[PDB]
Design a protein around this nucleic acid. Structure first.
Ligand code: MG
Ligand code: MG
Lengths: 1341, 50, 251, 50, 268
RNA sequence: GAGUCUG
DNA sequence: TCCGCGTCAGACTCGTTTATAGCATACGTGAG
DNA sequence: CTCACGTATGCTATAATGTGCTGACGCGG
């Protein structure tokens, strides 16, 4: 069972592991997230709903007035994506919000029966996400990258040494909300518990409890266990708990009943403890001297006097015991604090605490955050309540509360966003438990603690900020104004919200220009996770621990895809099957194993859930429809991996691919490649420029088709059916009745995008895949995007490669290429550059775009037309004028040499200059397109007007063909309905179709169908009119540009760049090279058959690199092409369909344990020859990642091609004709031409413009800059002798202004003498130091 | 050791160009220090022959 | 200065000077008006704050944020930082008669030679061409010589070939760790945009041709030419200065 | 790591062995980006002193 | 550790007496008659009012402290021109003065280039109009749409919105920008060649032709004279000067056709 | 200033 | 607690959003 | 020599009189 587009060309699968779950939609993250932000939910606070309910209702300070939110609505987008991109506007929907101004009476108590004003107010346009996953901001496609941040909740961490060479582990708790101040608890070397609010100055931890109204005795009752002391007759007694002592040394002789258990001064072992517990020991007699030091729990007072004998938390003595006895207390509650397990931490912290009561504690807290400002009681209560106990300033969020409750071992997941008094104490309790030794510290890098924010959460936050800025304004105006005249819209401002959101989608770090070199580049960019940007890490902040691969990254984040750069480890590609949980943690699919039998039941497990189960490996062998073949299966749990029994196994990896990301999944023999090289391989695939002829990969994986389809760059069929009309522009498909809805006309039109500019100025061209009258299913590829073959992803071009040295032409990775590659225009690449010419208005007057330009040859003006615009199709070269422009000049005081020259030619040329847009120097191309943007008031250019004539007539034609094909398709249906119950075949075709409003039949369901089709026909009739009026308006519409700018002309140049020495090429195993030489065909090593190799790569760049993938790819590539050469030979000699069928079935069903079955047969003869015609240019094979082809399978395939098992061949030198003395490995490596063309990098400068202050030449090729001669480079001249070369570089070559001109004159005069001076940067330095008020003088000789 | 040795050089143009420029220039300004330009860095700064 | 867009762009020192002048002049006013002393004091604090911001912003506590939120760049900040003026504009500089491109092998070269692209060399030796053009009387003056080069006339190539003869060019690779990271070569004019490097010196540059680039620099004076040919030439820097072992070795 | 990789490239590495490889690999690559600067700062301190 | 100029000043203001109605009247009568203490006390007591307005006037131009000090200048003018005879309270009158002086300062100091209040006031009305338009038109105001609403010239509205654009910081952008007033060595060298050639060209044409031609354009002479002004030297003619000027240029045109320029140096 | 990059 | 340090060139992009009363006399320079 | 134009300083009156983003680097002296 294969699809129509797969019947045309089938990839051979060497995979063996049946896929229980298919690769999901890859651009899932971006779409789901943003869809949640705009998604209208009544309940589920997601994006805007949440944002309004959070802020609103806003009630005035007086409390008479309030503004409340009803609902919102997005207007439809003013401009489509197309018009936005051209015009350079943001693709957005207007946000209209219903809001109700309600007013209370001040005279009545809370009478709401005064004024209720409800109206729908504009608050900004929100940018919309494209169906692909992008935003068009100011006419530029951008991607907002998902973020990775610390999840709110609690975290328990510990400086492992660091502070105090003492080497003490200081434990700490950090409570992180989603919004609010941070709450820190920490230990000190002296075991005192401290609180840092918002990581400010340190305060004793007990002070925060006093602020929450805890008495001293209540604090102690919370952290400490009590020990009772009974004073009987004269001897002291204490209530014993058998264990407590445990691992202590007995300070007294412990006697129970009459009989001595402990010996004094010996350590109490487990035997003593079980003896005491079984004997049921509750009182033990003790010496009075043991209480010296014990801490009293409660306040104990003299019942006679009523005065305090001892305060709570006070160290007892022999005399306080005596006074207590005689007062009439024969029971004393003392603290249990035995070092080791139960530490007296809070007891010691209370002694450090300078505060006494609640107020004194609140004042001290207040004085910390606001130091200086006098306390008031109202101020201190307000501040403390507004820190962690205000619904408006503190919000843990659902994820915060959930992680918080799980960390404190609760049952309930959901709860308050504000901190409860119970929360804080439980956190302190756990901190102290961890100090004692029971309980552990959580991990920060653990993905259970790192959460994903995609777009919708981030858009939501910026939108809340906008609302908060609005709330101040609103509340302010509600209080001041009269309530009754004043409506809600005069109070709201849209500009704050629009500004907050605009700044996110445009200024933000995470909003970046889409990387569009190729489909894979796009798809991988949109599934990026960045730990950087706002609310995240910085490069400075980023350590080594975060960057490295964490255990939990398994199945969630790619271990082998990260920029090799400063961002190494902070930026991460998402794994293949990975997805975001409801709370935003990453999760991965796993197959449930029940009673040892491995079900197809699939569970997505979060980072924290994964730890708990034992998960078998994907490569683990399952036994034919039940359990594991092998007894001890290789699995992983508790973050580590070993053998397990079958009964212990809970789960298993869904695919072998789930560990890897998209980009790395496309690397064939990844299994045989070093992880470093593989990283750069996956990184360079993104840099691959699409060639003129998009060539499939012979050695693929199978992700090729998934990626091409999900990227969106391919046109895919929604409805299917038969193709009515193909064109190099459009595809019209007639839909099948089964999916075709009976309401609208059932004809789908896909308009293809023709040759368009990319962000990297590469070429985007869609060509039609299918032929005229081809039957297609839903999800069939109808048109190929730029770097896609029939449905598969095609980033470059496969080539006959031989590994062997040449005469140093492949020295260090240098690449030797055959001329045949250049001839066949393979790796010829198309680039489209955009140049603008801006007519501005100056103080002197407006600039003119005339062809009438002072001092210009007829040669130049030949190419400009009436208006001063170059013609479409015109070839241009550096210095040719594209758009002629002149800047008005005022009274210009010329010199005697200039006045004598202007007199000679008489070309005074009025009061105007020459500021024409001309082709940049050395770039040379053909003008493909011209666009003109004018203002509204200014009279249009003749050329602008003819452009609008074209767009108008073309628009009319487009819409007319819509209505025509839609009417024809619709009456074609009415014709079939009328035949249903009314045979009138020939009789209906003769009368005109235009007079079919009269035609009906009997009142049944079929008469109602006729009514549907008639109401749609007329609907389309008016719709066509209002569409045409819209188009006409946009074409006439004068565009509002920047202030100062009257009009803009955009020229698009087209360039065909040929492959050439200096150009950078790579494979997919991270194997790069620069092309050194293009060899004539004659010179290239050739086979026994006479066929020359395309590329000669250096053997020595393999065993060091440890990317062995490229060699396996080459052997298999040759085997693939072997079989293509056999099919090509059988097709050239026609032969039998039966014989081709035989060979091809034996081929597909080769592999030792091939998963993929292909029962050829069912294929019809016509399907088989279309298939062979595609297989002829080499049988495409798929080697999954970690479930790839084996050596033995590749050698078996080679034998099927009658190629050698070694995959080495005899080669003959093209030059000499003699044979090479040993066999050479030859085959097909799929090669990529990266964006790094020599054409773009070569730069040279003799003299140019110079910098403003420093007077040094500028930097960069765009500014025509001199190369920087850095400290390092200077030192080299210092090591040498070279003193004149150095001074040259310091002086006449850089700053020295007089020196440089004088030496230029000398060099044209041929003097080659320096005449040095003083570098100008120094004169500035002096001025800058005197500006500081330091006298810095030059002292003369 | 290296860092202090470089700051102990009796040229304040070299000391300033290395590190700690604010502190070097206050101590030189207060001492009324005179740099006679003997080392290589000093000559490279004024754009002279090494 | 006026940007092309009609807008202006200015140094942050202007914002700091304007702070200082406004507060100072307001202080003169409040002194002429005999203001109560609390207000005089506030103005004196604000005046000291403005001058301290102008001299060294960020030392006196919280730096004054301008337009973005970034602290205004003060006088001391232009001198101090690595980026100040010392490290950036003075102990190293941007340089005339300097170029770059991708490097590629030249196995045919001798050890003292390097492939230099035609168009690159045309531009670097522009004054030297102008000079010979006028001595041959082929160019009447400099602007006519410039237009002959712009037109890239056939006679100009022959002159350029004549100038480059026995003229050494410095090749540099980042990073320049030791002195052999700069070497002099006699250039060989080549059609095409890539620099051709002799294999045996690839060791000293740590040059591998997977896209590395090199700076070219033209020694102008007779002195600089001689220092390049005698001291800095490839051939003459065979042994490592760090050890007695040679650097030029076949691989 | 206590469990070594028994296999070689020719035989074929699994997802577990490959995942475990990655740690060392990326620490190496991060080392080149981050560590390069203290070496260079030592060159510069040395140069200034001599 | 109170180091901040702002917190110190606000501490000092809080430390003041708050005035009543009868107290304001008593002090105000003494103040206008010219009491020292009365003026001081009325100002010091009403500093708090300056701060309330200056606190809601931040993030628009200057800093809070800069906005408070300018506001204090309004307080002084308010105390000077307060009328205690009118039953109406001081706070009401002072509020006008404080807002006036703050706004005026914010319109001048905030922009590097001195902008007139006349234009700023016009701008205010254009922007308020834009706000009302934006609330009803889901889109934003066009220049023409604002001009229609105010019944004013489109060009005038465009000029105003053109002055709204603020200045950008060079600190970097400085290094992209290059000196446009300073010519490059190549250009300066070209001028040297021309100036040197002229001297040689003057002693190549006739003695009377290079005298008259040079001293007119100010090539050899000191001042660039005209056809009629060449008469001051020795020429003292109007027709003979014009024939001889052009005769010098015609012989020089053939000197440029033969050397190899003329149409070659016409493009230039 | 924030990016995505090549050594 | 405070402050002094952190490799060398190259490519590209973005960015400098927002606010405030109306009309009379006075001060000062420029244009016809 | 005179007026217009550009720019500035003036005065108005319900009462109102107390502030306020991003947090976390690491080694040495
Ligand atoms: Mg290696
Ligand atoms: Mg390299």
């Amino acid at each position: 069972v294969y699809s129509y587009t797969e019947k045309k060309r089938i990839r051979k699968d060497f995979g063996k592991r049946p896929q229980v779950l298919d690769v999901p939609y890859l651009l899932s993250i971006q779409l789901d997230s943003f869809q949640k932000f705009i998604e209208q939910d009544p309940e589920g606070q997601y994006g805007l709903e949440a944002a309004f309910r959070s802020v609103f209702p806003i009630q005035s300070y007086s409390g008479n007035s309030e503004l409340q939110y009803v609902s919102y609505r997005l207007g439809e987008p003013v401009f489509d994506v197309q018009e936005c991109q051209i015009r350079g506007v943001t693709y957005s929907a207007p946000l209209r919000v219903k809001l109700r101004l309600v007013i209370y009476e001040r005279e009545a108590p809370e009478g709401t029966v005064k004024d209720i004003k409800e109206q729908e107010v504009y608050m900004g346009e929100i940018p919309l996400m494209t169906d692909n996953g992008t935003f068009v901001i100011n006419g530029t496609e951008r991607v907002i990258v998902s973020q990775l941040h610390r999840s709110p909740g609690v975290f328990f961490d510990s400086d492992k040494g660091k502070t105090h060479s003492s080497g003490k582990v200081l434990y700490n708790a950090r409570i992180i909300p989603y919004r609010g101040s941070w709450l820190d608890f920490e230990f000190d070397p002296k075991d005192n518990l401290f609180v840092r609010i918002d990581r400010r100055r340190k305060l004793p931890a007990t002070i925060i409890l006093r602020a929450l109204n805890y008495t001293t005795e209540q604090i102690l009752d919370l952290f400490f266990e009590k020990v009772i002391f009974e004073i009987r007759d004269n001897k002291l007694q204490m209530e014993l708990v058998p264990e407590r002592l445990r691992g202590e040394t007995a300070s007294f002789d412990i006697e129970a009943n009459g009989k001595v258990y402990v010996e004094k001064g010996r350590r109490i072992t487990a035997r003593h403890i079980r003896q005491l517990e079984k004997d049921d020991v509750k009182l033990i007699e003790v010496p009075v001297e043991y209480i010296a030091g014990k801490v009293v729990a409660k306040d104990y007072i003299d019942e006679s006097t009523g005065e305090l004998i001892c305060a709570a938390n006070m160290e007892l003595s022999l005399d306080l015991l005596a006074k207590l006895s005689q007062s009439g207390h024969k029971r004393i509650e003392t603290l249990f604090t035995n070092d080791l397990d139960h530490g007296p931490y809070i007891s010691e912290t209370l002694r450090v605490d300078p505060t006494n009561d609640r107020l004194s504690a609140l004042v001290e807290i207040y004085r910390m955050m606001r130091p200086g400002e006098p306390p008031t009681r109202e101020a201190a209560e307000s501040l403390f309540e507004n820190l962690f106990f205000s619904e408006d300033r503190y919000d843990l969020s659902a994820v915060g509360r959930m992680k918080f409750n799980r960390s404190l071992l609760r049952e309930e997941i959901e709860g308050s966003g504000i901190l409860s008094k119970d929360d804080i104490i439980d956190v302190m309790k756990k901190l102290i438990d961890i100090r004692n030794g029971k309980g552990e510290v959580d991990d920060i890098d653990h993905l259970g603690n790192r959460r994903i924010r995609s777009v919708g959460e981030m858009a939501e936050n910026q939108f809340r900020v906008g609302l908060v800025r609005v709330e101040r304004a609103v509340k302010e105006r509600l209080s001041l104004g009269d309530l009754d005249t004043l409506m809600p819209q005069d109070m709201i401002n849209a500009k704050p919200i629009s500004a907050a959101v605009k700044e996110f989608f445009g200024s933000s770090q995470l909003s970046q220009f889409m990387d569009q070199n190729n489909p894979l580049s796009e798809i991988t960019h949109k599934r990026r996770i960045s730990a950087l940007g706002p609310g995240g890490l910085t490069r400075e902040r980023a350590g080594f621990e975060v960057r490295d691969v964490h255990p939990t990254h398994y199945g969630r984040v790619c271990p082998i895809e990260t920029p090799e750069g400063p961002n190494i480890g902070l930026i991460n590609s998402l794994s293949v099957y990975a997805q975001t949980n409801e709370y935003g943690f990453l999760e991965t699919p796993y197959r449930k194993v029940t009673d040892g039998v491995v079900t197809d039941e699939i569970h997505y497990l979060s980072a924290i859930e994964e730890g708990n189960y034992v998960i078998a490996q994907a490569n683990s062998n399952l036994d034919e429809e039940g359990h594991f073949v092998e007894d001890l299966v290789t699995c992983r749990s508790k973050g580590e991996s070993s053998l397990f029994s079958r009964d212990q196994v809970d789960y298993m990896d869904v695919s072998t691919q789930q560990v890897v990301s998209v980009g790395a999944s496309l690397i064939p023999f990844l299994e045989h490649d070093d992880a470093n090289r593989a990283l750069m391989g996956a990184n360079m695939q993104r840099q691959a420029v699409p060639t003129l002829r998009a060539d499939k990969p012979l050695v693929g994986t199978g992700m090729e088709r998934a990626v091409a389809v999900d990227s969106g760059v391919t046109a895919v069929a929604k409805r299917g059916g038969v193709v009515q009309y193909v064109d190099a522009s459009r595809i019209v498909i007639k839909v099948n009745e089964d999916e075709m809805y009976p309401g609208e006309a059932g004809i789908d039109i896909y308009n293809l995008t023709k040759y368009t500019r990319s962000n990297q100025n590469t070429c985007i061209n869609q060509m039609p895949c299918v032929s005229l009258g081809e039957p297609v299913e839903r999800g069939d590829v109808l048109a190929d995007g730029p770097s896609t073959d029939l449905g598969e992803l095609a980033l470059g071009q496969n080539m006959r490669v031989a590994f062997m040295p040449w005469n140093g032409y492949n020295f260090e990775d240098s690449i030797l290429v055959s001329e045949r590659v250049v001839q066949e225009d393979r790796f010829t690449t198309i680039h489209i550059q955009e140049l603008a010419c801006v007519s501005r208005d100056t103080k002197l007057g407006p600039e003119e775009i005339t062809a009438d330009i002072p001092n210009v040859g007829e040669a130049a003006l030949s190419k400009l037309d009436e208006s001063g615009i170059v013609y479409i199709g015109a070839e241009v070269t550096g210095g040719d004028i594209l758009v002629g422009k002149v800047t008005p000049k005022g009274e210009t005081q010329l010199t005697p040499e200039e006045k004598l020259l202007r007199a000679i030619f008489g070309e005074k040329a009025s009061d105007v200059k020459d500021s024409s847009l001309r082709v940049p120097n050395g770039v040379s191309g053909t003008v493909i397109d011209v666009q003109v943007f004018t203002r509204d008031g200014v009279e249009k250019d003749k050329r602008a007007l003819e452009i609008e004539e074209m767009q108008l007539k073309q628009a009319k034609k487009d819409l007319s063909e819509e209505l025509q094909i839609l009417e024809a398709g619709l009456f074609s249906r009415i014709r079939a309905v009328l035949v249903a119950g009314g045979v009138e075949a020939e009789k209906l075709d003769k009368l005109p179709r235009d007079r079919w409003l009269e035609l009906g039949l009997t009142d049944e369901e079929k008469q109602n169908q006729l009514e549907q089709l008639a109401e749609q026909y007329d609907e389309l009739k008016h719709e066509f009119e209002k569409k045409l009026e819209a188009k006409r308006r946009k074409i006439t519409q004068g565009d509002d540009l920047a202030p100062g700018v009257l009009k803009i002309v955009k020229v698009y140049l087209a360039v065909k760049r040929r492959i050439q020495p200096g150009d950078k090429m790579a494979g997919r195993h991270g194997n790069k090279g620069v092309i050194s030489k293009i060899n004539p065909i004659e010179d290239m090593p050739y086979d026994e058959n006479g066929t020359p190799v395309d590329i000669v790569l250096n053997p020595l760049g393999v065993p060091s690199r440890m990317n062995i993938g490229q060699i396996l790819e080459t052997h298999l590539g040759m085997a693939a092409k072997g079989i293509g050469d056999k099919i090509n030979a059988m097709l050239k000699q026609q032969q039998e369909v039966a014989k081709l069928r035989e060979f091809i079935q034996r081929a597909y069903d080769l592999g030792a344990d091939v998963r993929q079955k292909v029962d050829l047969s069912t294929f019809s003869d016509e399907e088989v020859m279309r298939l062979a015609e595609n297989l002829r240019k080499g049988m495409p094979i798929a080697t999954p990642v970690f479930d790839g082809a084996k050596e033995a399978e590749i050698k078996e395939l080679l034998k099927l091609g009658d190629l050698p098992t070694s995959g080495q061949i005899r080669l003959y030198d093209g030059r000499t004709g003699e044979q090479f003395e040993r066999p050479v490995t030859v085959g097909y490596m799929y090669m990529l031409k990266l964006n790094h063309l020599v054409d773009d990098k070569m730069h040279a400068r003799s003299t140019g413009s110079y910098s403003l202050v420093t007077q040094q030449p500028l930097g960069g090729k765009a500014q025509f800059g001199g190369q920087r001669f850095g400290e390092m480079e200077v030192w080299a001249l210092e090591a040498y002798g070279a003193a004149y070369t150095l001074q040259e570089m310091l002086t006449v070559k850089s700053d020295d202004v007089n020196g440089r001109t004088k030496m230029y004159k000398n060099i044209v005069d041929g003097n080659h003498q320096m005449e040095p001076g003083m570098p100008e940067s120094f004169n500035v330095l002096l001025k800058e130091i005197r500006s500081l008020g330091i006298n810095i003088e030059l002292e003369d000789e | 050791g290296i860092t202090k040795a470089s700051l102990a050089t009796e040229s304040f143009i070299s000391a300033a160009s290395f590190q700690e420029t604010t502190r070097v220039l206050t101590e030189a300004a207060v001492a009324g220090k005179r740099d006679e330009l003997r080392g290589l860095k000093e000559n490279v700064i004024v754009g002279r022959l090494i | 200065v006026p940007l092309d867009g009609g807008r202006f762009a200015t140094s942050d020192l202007n914002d700091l000077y304007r702070r200082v002048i406004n507060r100072n002049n307001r202080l003169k006013r409040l002194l002429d008006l005999a203001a109560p002393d609390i207000i005089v004091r506030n103005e004196k604090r604000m005046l000291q704050e403005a001058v301290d911001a102008l001299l060294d912003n960020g030392r006196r506590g919280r730096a004054i944020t301008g337009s973005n939120k970034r602290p205004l760049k003060s006088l001391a900040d232009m001198i101090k930082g690595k980026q100040g003026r010392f490290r950036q504009n003075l102990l190293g500089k941007r340089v005339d008669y300097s170029g770059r491109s991708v490097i590629t092998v030249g196995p045919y070269l001798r050890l003292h030679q390097c492939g230099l692209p035609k168009k690159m060399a045309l531009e670097l030796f522009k004054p030297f061409i102008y000079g010979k053009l006028e001595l041959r009387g082929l160019a009447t003056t400099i602007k006519a010589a410039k237009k002959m080069v712009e037109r890239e006339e056939a006679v100009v190539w022959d002159i350029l070939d004549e100038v480059i003869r026995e003229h050494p060019v410095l090749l540099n690779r980042a990073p320049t760790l030791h002195r052999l990271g700069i070497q002099a070569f006699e250039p060989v004019l080549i059609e095409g945009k890539a620099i051709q490097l002799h294999p045996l010196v690839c060791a000293a540059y740590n040059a591998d041709f997977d896209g590395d680039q090199m700076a070219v620099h033209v020694p102008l004076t007779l002195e600089a030419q001689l220092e390049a040919r005698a001291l800095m030439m490839s051939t003459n820097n065979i042994l490592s200065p760090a050890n007695g072992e040679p650097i030029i070795v076949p691989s | 790591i206590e469990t070594p990789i028994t296999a070689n490239f020719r035989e074929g590495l699994n997802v577990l062995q490959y995942f475990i490889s990655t740690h060392g690999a990326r620490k190496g690559l991060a080392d080149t980006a981050l560590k390069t600067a203290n070496s260079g700062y030592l060159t510069r301190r040395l140069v200034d002193v001599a | 550790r109170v180091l901040d100029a702002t917190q110190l000043y606000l501490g000092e203001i809080g430390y003041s007496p708050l005035l009543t109605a009868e107290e304001e009247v008593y002090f105000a009568r003494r103040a206008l008659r010219g009491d020292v203490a009365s003026r001081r006390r009325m100002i010091e007591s009403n500093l708090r009012l300056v701060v309330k307005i200056a606190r809601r006037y931040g993030n628009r131009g200057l800093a809070l402290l800069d906005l408070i000090e300018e506001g204090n200048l309004g307080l002084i003018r308010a105390v000077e021109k307060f009328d205690p005879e009118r039953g109406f309270r001081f706070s009401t009158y002072a509020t006008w003065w404080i807002r006036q002086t703050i706004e005026r300062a914010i319109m001048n100091q905030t922009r590097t280039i001195r902008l007139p209040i006349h234009i700023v006031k016009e701008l205010n009305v254009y922007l308020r109009t834009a706000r009302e338009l934006s609330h009803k038109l889901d889109h934003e105001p066009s220049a023409e749409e604002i001009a229609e609403q105010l019944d004013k010239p489109v060009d005038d509205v465009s000029r105003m919105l053109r002055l709204n654009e603020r200045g950008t910081a060079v600190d970097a952008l400085l290094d992209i920008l290059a000196d446009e007033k300073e010519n490059g060595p190549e250009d300066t060298t070209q001028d040297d060649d021309m100036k040197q050639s002229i001297v040689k060209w003057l002693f190549e044409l006739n003695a009377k032709q290079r005298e008259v031609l040079a001293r007119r354009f100010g090539l050899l002479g000191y001042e660039a004279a005209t056809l009629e002004d060449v008469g001051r030297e020795i020429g003292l003619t109007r027709e003979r000067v014009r024939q001889i000027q052009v005769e010098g240029l015609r012989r020089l045109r053939e000197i440029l056709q033969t050397q190899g320029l003329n149409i070659e140096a016409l493009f230039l």
